[PDB]
Amino acid sequence: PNTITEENLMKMIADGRGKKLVVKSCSKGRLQGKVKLKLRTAKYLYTLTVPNADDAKSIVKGCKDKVEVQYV
Amino acid sequence: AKRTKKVGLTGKYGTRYGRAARKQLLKIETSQKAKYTCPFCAKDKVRRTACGIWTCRSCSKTMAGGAYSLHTEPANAARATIRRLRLARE
Amino acid sequence: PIIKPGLVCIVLQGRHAGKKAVIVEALPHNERGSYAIVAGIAALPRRIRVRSFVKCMNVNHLMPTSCRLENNYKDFISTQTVADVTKRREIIETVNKDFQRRILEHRDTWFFTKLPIDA
Amino acid sequence: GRRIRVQRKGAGSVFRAHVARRLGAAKLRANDFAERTGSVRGVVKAILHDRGRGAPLARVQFPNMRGEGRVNELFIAPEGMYTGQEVFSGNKATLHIGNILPVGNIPEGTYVCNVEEKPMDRGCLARASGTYCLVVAHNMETNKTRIRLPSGQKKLISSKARAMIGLVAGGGRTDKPLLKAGNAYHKYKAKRNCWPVVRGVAMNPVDHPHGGGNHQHIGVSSCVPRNAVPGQKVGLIAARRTGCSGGK
Amino acid sequence: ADCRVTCRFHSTYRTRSKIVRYKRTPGNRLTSLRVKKLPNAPHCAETGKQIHGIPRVIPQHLTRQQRKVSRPYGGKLCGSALRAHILESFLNEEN
RNA sequence: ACCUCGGGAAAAGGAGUGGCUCUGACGGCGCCGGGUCAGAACUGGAACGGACGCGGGGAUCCCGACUGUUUACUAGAAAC
RNA sequence: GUGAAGACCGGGAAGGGGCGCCCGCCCGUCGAACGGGGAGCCGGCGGAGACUCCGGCAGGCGCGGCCCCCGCGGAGACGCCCGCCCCCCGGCGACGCGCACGGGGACCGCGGCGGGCGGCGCCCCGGCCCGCGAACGCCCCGCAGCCCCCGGACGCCUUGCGCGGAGAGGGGGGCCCGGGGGCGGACCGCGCGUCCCCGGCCGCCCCUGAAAAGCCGGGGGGCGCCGGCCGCGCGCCGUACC
């Protein structure tokens, strides 16, 4: 797995490159209050750790509705 | 600080092997482990990799030599002959 | 005083090693060391385009030779140029064209003959 | 009676040479047109230790004269050969240690090694550590050169036969006492199964001619004839004289 | 309490290829991970010194920029050996 | 003693040793680690390597220098 | 080649290769379930099995579709944004032993802290049990070692050494380092040992410690790429248990 280089890379892949699902895990264990958006491209699983939940929402809108979005 | 009065590096062999063999070895093994002057880089770094094979630690030059001395006495005499005989031709 | 303008040298150390160069300018010695702006043949005329390197090199990395290759060169080659991005690219084209002319006429053959390095 | 140890040793099997991990056969550069009319030039790449030989062996790289590549030749190393030495092989090679020239060119009194017994033999004479042959005389009329072999014998060789100038290195190797049975074991491992040696007086009468009685004695003269058969030849072969006496 | 890892390899004989290092898995058990023998990085043809720039990975998995050095004779010769050859070639021509 | 000056030699022989209560040393200081080596009291049926583990030693003579090796299943030797 | 044969012995012989051409003396699809080798980890599942199943997550090696296009930067060591074939010159595979020393990993121990126990005549914050983080992908460091550039010396240093006008110290850099940290995958400290690997040394030898596929550079020649993304494939045999 790898860490996506910001939302610019995340959404560029989600707009045109291979993408299957963007899973939004939320604050597991309260180690962090951030939300983790994870995209499964054919090659790797790319994760964006978003400090603010509101910031994640705008990034999720950027992901095409063709990409499946799941929330956990 | 003089650990042994007579036997030198031959103290390794303890009391075994006789006196004559330990005296010859003292001279032979002092030459084998001696640092010789590099014929090329003029530095006393030459050490014996193998019998007949001596390598300068600093010069990095590997030279054919006597088994226990970088230069054998016969060989020095041979070198002097060849140099004189070559000069005689030219 | 061997190092001079219009002196052919061979680069000894660098990506352009083994290739002959010409000393367009010799910079005044400073804290960095002694350096010379050199323009040399990066690539031969062809296997059976001429390419030119125009950088400043430590004169310790240059082996002085006897051939001279006298050229106007310094009018377009200066410390201000070769330093900036662009302009150096323009002067590489002007030098590479001049090298093509000096090969088409078959001038300065020693400069345009590859150094035969073995092993 | 059992086939004796000498009889068994010639049948190969376990008594064969331990030739594994050995550099190769040390030989001179093949006689060629540029060695007949001219001199080829070679750089000493590496002075290395052969497994079974005390003398060091040098790998000298020569240009390929029948191709575009390079030829690597393993030679016995004359003392003074250094990494990067430019040796020369040929008729016009200069008189310097490590150069190989025909012995007719070589002046008299010169110390040479790896001499060719016959023209173009690749070298067969002085090859052991510290050994050397001496150019004694040149007979121009017969095109033959007398050399003094290491045993002090003198042989007439062809003037064409080639030799490498210099004593072979590793000299004085035999002066150091082996000291322990161990050191002999190590040296013989590198060479062949010839150690340890059991005296035949120690053996049974079936195993050896010297055999075994009640008092451990040869019981007949150790001196054996030259025409003794393979089992019989075990003592001093065709001894012209025996005993430890001063002279010669 | 009993960290006896057992044997990851097909046979128990511990040769140079069969070496294991132990870590902790996410499931709290000791694990055996094969330690691969690091390949030597290329060495100078003259000098025999590890050439700089090329990492000690099989060159099959390296990529061209990482398995090459940007200089004439970049991999075969070191920058001192190459400088020596440049000097000798030019100097021998003068004489 | 002797010696091939390496040994002999752990030669031969003696003395101490536990537990407590302390005191020194020794690094990386404000801090903060160390676990060794000394020294002292006080105690105990006159006890302490309290189990365990763990040379008896000395003077000679013969033989083989030595480390090795051997008759698997009667000889480990001075034999090889 | 030889021997009555059975058979034994073996280079000197018009002994191949994609390919008109062109190039070319001459064996092995024998031999090691311990040597070499392109690449696997975690979690789960069954009555019987797992580096094999299943779920997650990678890596290797091909093949196709599509897009694409053949150098640049630095004073230099080198960096970065990956051409191919022949013929050569190399490298990797690829290597001994030992004392010590240093660095990691696991193991261990001791504290704190959070959760759970047990015993309790007397004491007890003194006992015990648990507290997890893989391969791999990025990023940043990494002693020693080697190298660059300025410059021009009895200085620099190890446990032991060693080193330096054939270039020290000092200053600033490059590279390698079976490693660590961060992030992605997805309890907090602290110490002494042990064990394994590794590093720079040093000692040793009349002892000098395999080879080959496979892979990869460089020079010259000829030619023309590479790459990315997205699909898809990986056969044959062994695999229980002792």
Side-chain angles (χ1 to χ4, degrees), chain A residues 10-61:
Chain A
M10 167 64 84
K11 270 111 75 81
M12 185 192 324
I13 298 196
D15 292 346
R17 227 202 93 175
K19 21 75 206 320
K20 294 151 186 46
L21 220 158
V22 222
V23 215
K24 194 218 225 62
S25 183
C26 310
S27 65
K28 167 207 57 187
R30 249 32 62 98
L31 173 67
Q32 21 76 228
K34 326 163 92 70
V35 272
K36 278 194 302 189
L37 274 167
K38 303 117 163 285
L39 182 76
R40 247 304 283 174
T41 193
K43 271 284 296 177
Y44 295 107
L45 172 64
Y46 285 122
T47 306
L48 183 56
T49 316
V50 210
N52 307 331
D54 44 281
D55 287 349
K57 300 178 332 185
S58 59
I59 304 319
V60 163
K61 294 154 197 163

Side-chain angles (χ1 to χ4, degrees), chain D residues 21 45 49-51 61 68-70 72 173-174 176 178 183 186-187 190:
Chain D
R21 301 177 310 267
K45 290 318 194 68
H49 177 69
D50 195 20
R51 177 191 179 185
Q61 201 153 330
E68 78 160 43
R70 292 204 55 90
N72 277 261
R173 200 204 62 233
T174 322
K176 171 162 191 175
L178 284 168
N183 296 356
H186 292 309
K187 170 187 177 173

Side-chain angles (χ1 to χ4, degrees), chain D residues 88-215:
Chain D
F88 276 77
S89 186
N91 278 211
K92 307 176 188 166
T94 54
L95 196 77
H96 284 77
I97 290 191
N99 290 10
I100 316 163
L101 24 152
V103 290
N105 300 15
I106 309 191
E108 292 113 321
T110 301
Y111 283 38
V112 281
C113 53
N114 214 4
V115 194
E116 290 186 328
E117 220 158 3
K118 284 179 176 179
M120 310 177 67
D121 233 354
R122 310 293 148 261
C124 295
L125 296 183
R127 305 174 55 173
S129 77
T131 69
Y132 77 92
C133 279
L134 192 107
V135 189
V136 175
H138 297 314
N139 214 215
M140 311 86 181
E141 32 268 11
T142 63
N143 201 238
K144 234 157 250 61
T145 292
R146 182 171 46 177
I147 35 102
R148 175 217 132 269
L149 296 153
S151 52
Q153 300 182 30
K154 288 188 179 51
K155 192 173 188 154
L156 261 299
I157 59 176
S158 184
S159 287
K160 305 293 169 50
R162 314 167 299 106
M164 185 158 33
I165 309 154
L167 198 100
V168 5
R173 200 204 62 233
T174 322
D175 303 346
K176 171 162 191 175
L178 284 168
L179 205 80
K180 350 185 314 181
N183 296 356
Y185 166 76
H186 292 309
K187 170 187 177 173
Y188 293 126
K189 267 203 56 188
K191 298 171 162 299
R192 76 207 64 89
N193 200 25
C194 50
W195 189 89
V197 198
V198 206
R199 297 165 293 112
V201 280
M203 308 179 175
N204 287 276
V206 46
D207 313 329
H208 205 258
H210 299 164
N214 288 24
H215 267 259

